[PDB]
Swiss-Prot record, chain A:
Coiled coil (residue ranges): 12-44
Effect ascribed to mutating residue 52 to D: Abolishes interaction with CHMP2A and assembly into helical tubes in vitro
Entry keywords, A to Z: Apoptosis, Cell cycle, Cell division, Coiled coil, Cytoplasm, Endosome, Isopeptide bond, Lipoprotein, Membrane, Myristate, Phosphoprotein, Protein transport, Transport, Ubl conjugation
Effect of residue 49 to E: Abolishes dimerization
GO MF term (any one): ubiquitin-specific protease binding
Other notes: Its overexpression strongly inhibits HIV-1 release.
Subcellular location: Cytoplasm, Cytosol; Membrane; Endosome; Late endosome membrane
Subunit composition and interactions: Probable core component of the endosomal sorting required for transport complex III (ESCRT-III). ESCRT-III components are thought to multimerize to form a flat lattice on the perimeter membrane of the endosome. Several assembly forms of ESCRT-III may exist that interact and act sequentially. Forms a metastable monomer in solution; its core structure (without part of the putative autoinhibitory C-terminal acidic region) oligomerizes into a flat lattice via two different dimerization interfaces.
Boundaries of the shown chain within the full protein: 11 to 169 of 222
Name of the gene this protein is made from: CHMP3
Record's protein name: Charged multivesicular body protein 3
Notes on the domains: The acidic C-terminus and the basic N-termminus are thought to render the protein in a closed, soluble and inactive conformation through an autoinhibitory intramolecular interaction. The open and active conformation, which enables membrane binding and oligomerization, is achieved by interaction with other cellular binding partners, probably including other ESCRT components.
Summary of the tissues where the protein is detected: Widely expressed. Expressed in heart, brain, placenta, lung, liver, skeletal muscle, kidney and pancreas.
Curated annotation (Swiss-Prot), chain B:
Cellular compartments per GO CC: amphisome membrane; autophagosome membrane; chromatin; cytosol; ESCRT III complex; extracellular exosome; kinetochore; kinetochore microtubule
Coiled coil segments of this chain: 5-46
Post-translational modification, as annotated: ISGylated in a CHMP5-dependent manner. Isgylation weakens and inhibits its interactions with VPS4A and VTA1 respectively.
Natural source organism: Homo sapiens
Major site of localization recorded for this protein: membrane
Whole sequence portion shown: 8 to 154 of 222
Record's subunit section: Probable core component of the endosomal sorting required for transport complex III (ESCRT-III). ESCRT-III components are thought to multimerize to form a flat lattice on the perimeter membrane of the endosome. Several assembly forms of ESCRT-III may exist that interact and act sequentially. In vitro, heteromerizes with CHMP3 (but not CHMP4) to form helical tubular structures that expose membrane-interacting sites on the outside whereas VPS4B can associate on the inside of the tubule. Interacts with CHMP1B, CHMP2B, CHMP3, CHMP4A, CHMP4B, CHMP4C and CHMP5.
MF (Gene Ontology): phosphatidylcholine binding; protein domain specific binding
Extra remark: Its overexpression strongly inhibits HIV-1 release.
Membrane topology reported for the UniProt record: Peripheral membrane protein
Localization annotation: Late endosome membrane; Nucleus envelope
The protein's role, per its UniProt record: Probable core component of the endosomal sorting required for transport complex III (ESCRT-III) which is involved in multivesicular bodies (MVBs) formation and sorting of endosomal cargo proteins into MVBs. MVBs contain intraluminal vesicles (ILVs) that are generated by invagination and scission from the limiting membrane of the endosome and mostly are delivered to lysosomes enabling degradation of membrane proteins, such as stimulated growth factor receptors, lysosomal enzymes and lipids. The MVB pathway appears to require the sequential function of ESCRT-O, -I,-II and -III complexes.
Keyword Nucleotide-binding: no
The protein's name: Charged multivesicular body protein 2a
Keywords: Acetylation, Coiled coil, Endosome, Host-virus interaction, Membrane, Nucleus, Phosphoprotein, Protein transport, Transport, Ubl conjugation
Length: 159, 147
C-alpha cells in the first residue's frame, strides 16, 4: 500500500529529526559552557587566549549550522514524499470521477438527441406559423389604427 | 451492478473526503510553518547569521508546498463542479424530449389544411354577416328617408 508506507517513513523522519535536535541541544550546552569560559578568560586579562576560545566559539556554531541544514533537508524530502502521495491520490480521484462520468453519460448519446433537436425545431416551425395565422386572421377583423387611438382616449376617461 | 446515480453520489462524497483530508494536511503544514517562524525568531536574537538563512529557505519551501496543496484542493473541487452539471444536462435532455413529444402530438391534431379550411369558413360567414346587415340597413334607411 502506498499510503501505509508514507506514514511509517514520515514518522521515522521526525524520529530522526528529533535526534538531530538533541544533538543540537547538547552542542548548545557545550556552547554555553565555552561562552562562560570565554568570559572568564576575558576578565583575567589574558585577552590573547580569548582568540583561541573564540575559534572554539565559532567551530561549534559551524557544527550547529551543519546539523540544522541536515534537519531542514530531511524535512524537505519528507514534504516531497507527502506531496507525491497527495498527487497520486488526486489522480486516483480523477480516474474514479471519469469512471462514473462515462457510466452516466452512456445513456444519452448524440444521435438520439439530435433527432429530438430536429423534432423540436420542426414542431416549433409549425407552431409559429399556426400562431401567426391565428393572429393575422383575428387582426384582419377590423381596423387597428382606428381602435388603437381610442385606446389612449379610454385611459383618460378611466383615470 | 450499480445504477449510474449511485456511483455519482459515492464519487462526489469521496471527492469531499479528499478535500477534507487535503485541508487537514495543509493545516498540519501551517502549524509546522508557525513553529518555523517561532524558531527563527528565537534564533534571530541569538544570531549565527546563517541558521536563520537555512530556516528561511525551509519556510519558503513550506509555503511553496502549501501553495500546491491548496491547488490540488481546487483541482479536486473543480471536477466535482464539472460533474454537477452533468445530471442537469441529462434532466434537460429528458424533459426536452418529453415536451417535444407533447408538442408533436399537439400539432398532429390540427394540421395545416383543416385549420385553413376553418379559417376560410369563418371568414366567409363573417362576409355573410356584413352583407346581410349592411343590406338591411341600406334598404330600411332608404325606405324611411326624409332626413
Amino acid at each position: 500500500p502506498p499510503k501505509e508506507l508514507v506514514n511509517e517513513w514520515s514518522l521515522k523522519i521526525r524520529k530522526e529529526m528529533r535526534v538531530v535536535d538533541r544533538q543540537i541541544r547538547d552542542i548548545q550546552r557545550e556552547e554555553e559552557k565555552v561562552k562562560r569560559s570565554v568570559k572568564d578568560a576575558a576578565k583575567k586579562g589574558q585577552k590573547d587566549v580569548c582568540i583561541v576560545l573564540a575559534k572554539e566559539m565559532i567551530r561549534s556554531r559551524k557544527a550547529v549550522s551543519k546539523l540544522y541544514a541536515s534537519k531542514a533537508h530531511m524535512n524537505s524530502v519528507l514534504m516531497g514524499m507527502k506531496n507525491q502521495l497527495a498527487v497520486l491520490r488526486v489522480a486516483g480521484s480523477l480516474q474514479k470521477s471519469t469512471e462514473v462520468m462515462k457510466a452516466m453519460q452512456s445513456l444519452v448519446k448524440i444521435p438520439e438527441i439530435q433527432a429530438t433537436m430536429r423534432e423540436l425545431s420542426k414542431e416549433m416551425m409549425k407552431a409559429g406559423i399556426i400562431e401567426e395565422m391565428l393572429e393575422d386572421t383575428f387582426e384582419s377583423m377590423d381596423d387597428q389604427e382606428e381602435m388603437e387611438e381610442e385606446a389612449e382616449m379610454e385611459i383618460d376617461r378611466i383615470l | 451492478r450499480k445504477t449510474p446515480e449511485e456511483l455519482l453520489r459515492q464519487n462526489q462524497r469521496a471527492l469531499n473526503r479528499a478535500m477534507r483530508e487535503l485541508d487537514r494536511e495543509r493545516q498540519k503544514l501551517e502549524t509546522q510553518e508557525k513553529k518555523i517562524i517561532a524558531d527563527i525568531k528565537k534564533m534571530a536574537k541569538q544570531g549565527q547569521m546563517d541558521a536563520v538563512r537555512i530556516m528561511a529557505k525551509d519556510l519558503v519551501r513550506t509555503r511553496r508546498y502549501v501553495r500546491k496543496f491548496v491547488l490540488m484542493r481546487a483541482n479536486i473541487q473543480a471536477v466535482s463542479l464539472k460533474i454537477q452539471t452533468l445530471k442537469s444536462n441529462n434532466s434537460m435532455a429528458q424533459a426536452m424530449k418529453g415536451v417535444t413529444k407533447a408538442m408533436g402530438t399537439m400539432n398532429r391534431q390540427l394540421k395545416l389544411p383543416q385549420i385553413q379550411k376553418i379559417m376560410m369558413e369563418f371568414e366567409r360567414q363573417a362576409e355573410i354577416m356584413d352583407m346581410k346587415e349592411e343590406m338591411m340597413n341600406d334598404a330600411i334607411d332608404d325606405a324611411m328617408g326624409d332626413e
